[PDB]
């Protein structure tokens, strides 16, 4: 009762009919009273000569007074009264609600344009938090509603709160909710949706200073008040799922869970510590009866493993990560594909694992469903060669990859062929050899042989494909005279006898093909001018060319596309194309100009009974067998003895090659040595 | 009975105990019989001296004979018999099934690696189509099963049929199914899923030599037999939905409809004539009770409108396109958003429509939900300026666009402000003026004034944003002293008095801010110490988050090069060229949080518009009357912000004014 400090303000605050107080006088008085109360020290203060105003500052005439100033000052005063009297809690619950609706109003106006009393309201909110009087709001019979309202105030989009207060707003909402056991779903929708509805980094721009109250608030709550929020997050997940589930609309559940998963994915990125609150649901979702939810859960954890996080998922939540890798054996193929689709990014984003991955992909590469096998080989296509070489190391993967090249299934086989070839190419142009990676190389080095062995299956499409693929990735057409050979040897380095016999056969055919296209043009030129409509050979040469064209078209998958193509070329009867074509097949051409005639030739055919595109894809593959690429001025480079001694594995190839080049057709071979002499 | 031609083959084909026929002999004999029969004439032929072999060629000893050859030749022979005896069909349905399982076998082997009788089987399939004998398969009691099998054969991925036969394979399946009224769903999922599972733009990677039977077949069926297939396509859609609905799994339907929609989207791209078969379902889906199906259906047509097609959707199926644009008034906001999200790509892809769109966006721009509004203004952000200027022309769009910049809703306000600024910038650097777009320019010309008037709201965040926006799009730092002014005048060209007062105030403030930040390090170098605190708190008073500034400057001062950069940026009177160089490096290194803090301060603190530009603003050619009157307006103030300069001339001018 007795104190050293004392309230020195004693002016009336209530306007009656007998004695009236002007609005301005009342404003000034309430200002004074506010300023004075603020200064008061809680412990050292009379407090007895203050009930007068305790009783006065709750009059509805002031609570709902027109002038905002009176209301704001009243708010502050009451803020202080609460602070001084506590922990006695002088007002009754009713009065306290009446006060706390006023404070909410003040908070509401705080986000509005300045009413000239922003400062008072700043004081209000700050001091309501500092002295923790705010939480009184929670012990009221209307607390839930007041909570919802309190939250809607600050999360309202139409309000513009300054950034300075965000830490305070997160405080207010922090404390007020820390007193709650069961928070209304509404508030939680409010708090959590902000993760969905506000994604930074979405608009590339100059400063991105824009910022958002509700989001930072959500972060403050989910970071600073994690321990109390997690409990609710769990309830949010379960309740939302529960709500969607029992919904009359039967197609909502999936749509909402797919959203929850996004909420989760964001939380993991922003506040990974919270994910613990719902990780169990996911864990159980992976093993759910409905395949779709397993698919989604798989996709989710798939997304998680590729996201930047201060925390580490496999360390933190190994339990479910194991359950994640456990989905390479899910009954539903869709789930397996869903899993397998995620690896490239994972590998591309984390080296954390090369153990379970290598364990899993091995099974994924020999799965009964061709979709997953395709999605498996797609790895070698989508993620860069280097990261493959670094991350995946299991023997079985490569063997299976190459193994599928002989598979019945077409769509897999083709992709396989193309992939492992482009891979072979890239797997030499980027990765060198050491003492430890050579262990798998004996597989990457048997790629060309394997490729060349496909010819033995005798399929037109496959032969066409291998033809196309070899000259695309293996034996390229660029970029110089020496390295083509240097690599050529490395391609020939690891061959079995079959690979050599086929390699040579393919070359033995080239001369017979050249001897055919040359005569093809020599016979096609017959329509340059009238030589014999029915004269010299009219009745006989037409049926030599006509029947000759079938010979070259007997090796192509779609002969009816071949016989049609070149006849239209006879329809053309343009000399340029004939000169280039003829030039490509005549044998003995410097390697460099061949490229020049070929590229222009193919480019020329583009964009002029059906589309020429065909004719291009026909004559190109047809040329790959027809023209000389390997037996040419390369000879001159193999001729130069690159090494005095050593490198026996190179000289035996020099031999293997030249020995044959001298045998298949020596019209070219014996001449260079003559030039050398 | 009497004919000119007669069967000249009369060797036995059935091996009995008394007389045995070697396998090879049987091969040769059946070969001969095949060859002979092949040449026979269908109408002009005895046909009586043939029953002998008709009866023999159904014996299980031949039909299911071990040697593939026997079976192939038997198949061919039978194929010719069917053709010769046609249309009488002497055989029983049973025998005919037994034959047709054999033919199916042959087709099966036709896609396998060569079996040595590939020729005979090619002949088989070809002539079975030419003489149209295949369709007999359809009038059997097991026809459904044989159909399913027949289709499974060719759509089999484990089989590799040569390309030359694809047109024929599309024929066989064409005819055989053209005889069916109720096709087992299996076949239709078979035919149609192929559109989903094989996209010819996913597989190009080198030579494009790849091809696939099932797909080309599906197209042939859906193209050449469109009239016959659409009829089924309808049934496929309805049945798929019906199955999905009652599938007990309650989340199945949506996944299935979203896939059907993809099927549709592919069909429109490849065979747009077929969409007629299901366009009604979509039409009714758009007006469905469930919002989600409306949403999906809406986006679908959204997708349609952006794809290259030999046909035109708004012309062909206007009925539903109207129903699509009818979705700007759907009860469900998600649907509205879904609609509004598709336009940017559409407009950039089609000029076909500028009437209904302009009609709609006006409505979309004043929607009660801020989401649709945001996604509306996003148009001006995502699609290039030109396409905007050409495609959308309605007054309401632009007015609403600029109008939303002053709306209570924040997320709208912000995007609005930034967007119309980027638009302003791009809308002068790229688009010229004409007779009727000037009417829109007179609105686009009020962007700078509107922006500068926003400062008067006195919101820290807004002021920060407008600050950021101005120096990014309106008054950039690029590229050299000579041109900046020329356009600076053009932005200042259309100002009201407020815009000028604020424009000048911003610079009257600039010197006082410089006067502080310059003093900041000068105060940090250490009676003034308790002024440092007040200036340092003062400098952060203009910022939305001062509590992030006061920490920032302590973090930079914690060190106690950058200091020189700051001084250089703030000292005033700096060659604008170096300003850029010191400015950029500072932020680039300072970035990799704090970076976002000092920049905004610099935008208000450092000299950009009042700088070495002045010597360039002084030099004129006389000459534009619209520029020279403004140059005074500017310099006049520049003399007030800093009288250090023009104090010498004007005084002498004052004297000569006096002497007068």
């Amino acid at each position: 009762k007795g104190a050293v400090t004392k309230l020195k303000f004693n002016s009336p605050i209530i306007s009656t009919s007998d004695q009236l107080i002007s609005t301005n006088e009342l404003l000034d008085r309430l200002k004074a009273l506010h300023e004075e109360l603020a200064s008061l020290d809680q412990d050292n203060t009379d407090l007895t000569g203050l009930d007068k105003y305790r009783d006065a500052l709750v009059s509805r005439k002031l609570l709902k007074h027109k002038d905002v100033g009176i209301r704001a000052f009243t708010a502050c005063c009451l803020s202080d009264i609460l602070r001084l009297y506590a922990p006695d809690a002088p007002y009754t619950d009713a009065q306290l609600t009446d006060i706390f609706k006023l404070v909410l109003s003040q908070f509401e106006q705080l986000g509005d344009q300045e009413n000239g009393y922003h400062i008072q309201q700043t004081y209000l909110i700050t001091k309501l938090l500092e002295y923790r009087s705010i939480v009184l709001l929670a012990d009221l019979p209307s607390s839930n509603n007041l909570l919802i309202e309190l939250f809607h105030i600050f999360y309202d989009p139409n309000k513009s709160f300054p950034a300075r207060l965000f830490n305070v707003i997160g405080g207010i909402l922090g404390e007020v909710i820390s007193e709650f056991d069961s928070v209304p779903l509404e508030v939680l929708r409010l708090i959590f949706n902000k993760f969905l509805t506000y994604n930074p980094n979405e608009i590339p721009e100059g400063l991105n200073v824009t910022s958002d109250c509700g989001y930072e608030v959500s972060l403050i709550l989910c970071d600073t008040y994690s321990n109390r929020m997690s409990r609710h997050l769990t309830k949010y997940y379960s309740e939302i799922i529960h709500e969607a589930t029992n919904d009359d609309n039967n197609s909502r559940l999936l749509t909402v869970v797919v959203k929850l998963h996004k909420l989760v994915l964001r939380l993991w990125e922003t506040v990974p510590e919270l994910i613990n609150a719902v990780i169990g649901f996911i864990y159980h979702e992976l093993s759910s009866e409905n395949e779709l939810f397993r698919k989604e859960a798989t996709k989710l954890i798939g997304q998680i493993l590729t996201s930047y996080s201060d925390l580490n998922f496999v360390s933190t939540h190994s339990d479910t990560f194991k359950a994640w890798i456990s989905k390479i054996a899910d009954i539903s193929p869709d789930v397996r594909v869903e899993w397998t689709e995620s690896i490239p990014q994972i590998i591309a984003t984390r080296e954390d694992i090369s153990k379970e991955l290598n364990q899993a992909l091995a099974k994924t590469f020999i799965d009964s469903d061709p979709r997953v096998r395709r999605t498996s080989v797609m790895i070698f296509n989508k993620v860069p060669v280097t990261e493959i070489w670094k991350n995946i190391t299991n023997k079985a993967i490569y063997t299976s990859l190459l193994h599928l090249a002989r598979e019945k299934h077409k769509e897999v086989r083709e992709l396989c062929i193309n992939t492992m070839a482009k891979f072979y190419s890239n797997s030499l142009n980027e990765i060198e050899r050491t003492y430890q990676n050579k262990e798998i190389w004996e597989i990457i080095d048997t790629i060309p042989s394997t490729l060349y062995n496909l010819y033995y299956i005798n399929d037109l499409n496959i032969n066409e494909q291998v033809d196309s693929v070899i000259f695309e990735y293996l034996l390229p057409f660029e970029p110089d005279n020496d390295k083509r050979v240097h690599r050529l040897l490395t391609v020939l380095s690891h061959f079995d006898k079959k690979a050599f016999t086929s390699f040579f056969a393919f070359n033995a055919r080239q001369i017979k093909i050249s001897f055919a296209i040359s005569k093809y043009i020599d016979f096609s030129k017959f329509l340059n001018n009238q030589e014999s409509m029915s004269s010299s050979q009219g009745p006989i040469v037409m049926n030599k060319y006509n029947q000759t064209l079938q010979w070259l078209a007997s090796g192509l998958s779609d002969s009816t596309k071949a016989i049609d193509a070149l006849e239209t070329i006879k329809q053309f009867n343009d000399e340029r194309i004939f000169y280039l074509l003829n030039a490509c097949v005549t044998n003995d051409i410097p390697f460099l100009t061949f490229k020049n005639c070929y590229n222009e030739l193919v480019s020329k055919l583009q964009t002029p009974s059906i589309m020429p595109r065909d004719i291009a894809k026909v004559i190109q593959i047809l040329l790959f067998r027809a023209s000389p690429i390997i037996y040419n001025v390369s000879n001159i480079s193999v001729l130069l003895n690159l090494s005095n001694n050593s490198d026996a594995k190179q000289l035996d190839l020099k031999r293997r090659i030249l020995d044959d080049i001298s045998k298949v057709n020596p019209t070219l071979f014996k001449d260079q040595i003559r030039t050398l002499k | 009975k009497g004919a000119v031609t007669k069967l000249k083959f009369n060797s036995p084909i059935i091996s009995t105990s008394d007389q045995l026929i070697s396998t090879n002999e049987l091969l040769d004999r059946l070969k001969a019989l095949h060859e002979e029969l092949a040449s026979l004439d269908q109408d002009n032929t005895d046909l009586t001296g043939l029953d002998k072999y008709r009866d023999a060629l159904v014996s299980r000893k031949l039909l299911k004979h071990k040697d593939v050859g026997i079976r192939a030749f038997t198949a061919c022979c039978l194929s010719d018999i069917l053709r010769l005896y046609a249309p009488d069909a002497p055989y029983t349905d049973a025998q005919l099934t037994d034959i047709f399982k054999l033919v199916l076998s042959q087709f099966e082997q036709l896609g396998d690696q060569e079996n040595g009788y590939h020729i005979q089987q090619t002949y088989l399939i070809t002539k079975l189509l030419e003489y149209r004998s295949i369709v007999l398969l359809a009038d059997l009691p097991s026809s459904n099963n044989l159909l399913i099998e027949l289709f499974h054969i060719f759509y089999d991925p484990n089989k590799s049929f040569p390309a030359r036969l694809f047109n024929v394979i599309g024929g066989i399946l064409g005819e055989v199914i053209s005889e069916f009224d109720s096709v087992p769903l299996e076949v239709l999922r078979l035919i149609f899923n192929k559109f989903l599972t094989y996209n010819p733009n996913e597989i190009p990677e080198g030579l494009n030599v790849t091809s696939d039977c099932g797909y080309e077949v599906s197209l042939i069926l859906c193209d050449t037999y469109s009239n016959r297939m659409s009829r089924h396509l309808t049934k496929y859609y309805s049945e798929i939905i019906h199955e999905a609905t009652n599938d007990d799994n309650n989340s199945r339907l949506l996944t299935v409809v979203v896939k059907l929609h993809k099927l549709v989207l592919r069909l429109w791209e490849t065979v747009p004539e077929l969409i007629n078969a299901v366009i009604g379902f979509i039409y009714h889906e758009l007006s469905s009770e469930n919002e989600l199906f409306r949403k999906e259906a809406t986006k679908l047509i959204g997708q349609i409108l952006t794809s290259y097609s030999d046909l035109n959707f708004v012309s062909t199926h206007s009925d539903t396109f109207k129903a699509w644009i009818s979705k700007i008034a759907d009860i469900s906001p998600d649907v509205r958003v879904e609609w509004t999200e598709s336009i940017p790509q559409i407009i950039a892809t089609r000029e076909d429509i500028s009437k209904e769109l302009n009609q709609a966006l006006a409505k979309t721009f004043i929607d009660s939900d801020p989401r649709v509004r945001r996604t509306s203004v996003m148009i001006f952000n995502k699609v290039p300026v030109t396409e905007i200027w050409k495609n959308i022309t309605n007054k309401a769009i632009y007015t609403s666009l600029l109008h939303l910049a002053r709306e209570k809703h924040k997320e709208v306000r912000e995007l609005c402000i930034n967007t119309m600024a980027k638009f302003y910038s791009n809308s002068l650097n790229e688009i010229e003026r004409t007779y009727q777009n000037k009417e829109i320019w007179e609105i686009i010309d009020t962007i700078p004034s509107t922006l500068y008037n926003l400062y008067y709201i006195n919101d820290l965040n807004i002021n920060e944003q407008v600050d950021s926006v101005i120096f990014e799009y309106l008054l950039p730092f690029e590229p050299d002293n000579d041109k900046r002014v020329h356009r600076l005048l053009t932005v200042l060209s259309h100002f009201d008095k407020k815009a000028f007062t604020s424009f000048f105030a911003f610079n009257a403030r600039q010197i006082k801010i410089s006067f502080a930040i310059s003093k900041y390090i000068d105060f940090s170098k250490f009676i003034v110490m308790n002024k440092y605190n007040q200036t340092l708190q003062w400098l952060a008073s203009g910022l939305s988050d001062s509590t992030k500034a006061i920490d920032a400057l302590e973090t930079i001062k914690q060190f106690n090069r950058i200091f020189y950069l700051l001084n250089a940026c703030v000292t005033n009177d700096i060659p604008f060229l170096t300003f850029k160089n010191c400015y950029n490096e500072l932020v680039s290194k300072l970035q990799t949080d704090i970076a976002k803090v000092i920049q905004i301060l610099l935008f208000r603190a450092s000299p950009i518009i009042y700088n070495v530009s002045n010597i360039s603003v002084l030099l004129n050619l006389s000459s534009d009357a619209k520029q020279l009157d403004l140059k005074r307006r500017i310099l006049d103030d520049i003399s007030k912000v800093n009288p250090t300069l023009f104090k010498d001339q004007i005084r002498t001018l004052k004297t000569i004014i006096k002497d007068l």
């Binding site: 344009q113 | 002053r406 209570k408 407020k498 008073s541 203009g542």
Partner: peptide, 17 residues
């Protein structure tokens, strides 16, 4: 509702002292 312009031409981006 719509936000309202609420200051005069004199005090804009002003700072005392």
């Amino acid at each position: 509702l719509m936000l309202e312009d609420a200051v005069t031409e004199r005090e804009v981006l002003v700072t005392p002292g």
